[PDB]
Amino acid sequence: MYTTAQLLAANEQKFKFDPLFLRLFFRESYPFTTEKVYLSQIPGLVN
Amino acid sequence: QNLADPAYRRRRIIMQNMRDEELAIAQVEEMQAVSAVLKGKYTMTGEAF
Amino acid sequence: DPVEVDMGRSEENNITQSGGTEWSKRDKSTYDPTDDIEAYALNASGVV
């Protein structure tokens, strides 16, 4: 029983990961009300 | 999820068409400048003219 | 009496340049060693 174990600090093992993508590209967020979502684009070419 | 009447759709078509015609004018306008300071000559020739 | 200490080092922080590519099997002029530096700095577990 006579052990006297003295505990010191621990580690974290934190990760090298940051978004960089929702933080630079996908910056604006949109919730959904429907199940599907379209993505239309207008191709314009006058003459 | 949010439609409109064909009337405001007609308004949208009118505004878009005005935009397209203005763009076509601005674009065809540079043709003469390109001919002028590209050769010193220009040709104003095309059908219905 | 022997007392062994495993400090907690990982083997991928104990690289040996052994191979055909350490530094001496290269041209000193054309090669940049920084590529090895970042290739080893990935498993840094923090800033170095």
From Swiss-Prot, chain A:
Localization in the cell: Virion; Host cytoplasm
Subunit structure: Homomultimer. Interacts with FI protein.
Family as reported in the entry's similarity comment: Belongs to the lambda phage major capsid protein family.
Function of the protein: Assembles to form an icosahedral capsid with a T=7 symmetry. The icosahedral capsid is about 60 nm in diameter and composed of 415 major capsid proteins. The assembly is primed by the interaction between capsid assembly protease and portal dodecamer, and major capsid proteins assemble cooperatively to form the procapsid with the help of capsid scaffolding protein. Major capsid protein forms hexons and pentons of the icosahedron. Viral genomic DNA is packaged into the procapsid through the portal vertex.
Protein name: Major capsid protein
Organism: Escherichia phage lambda
Record lineage: Viruses, Duplodnaviria, Heunggongvirae, Uroviricota, Caudoviricetes
Gene assigned in the entry: E
Residues of the full protein shown: 3 to 49 of 341
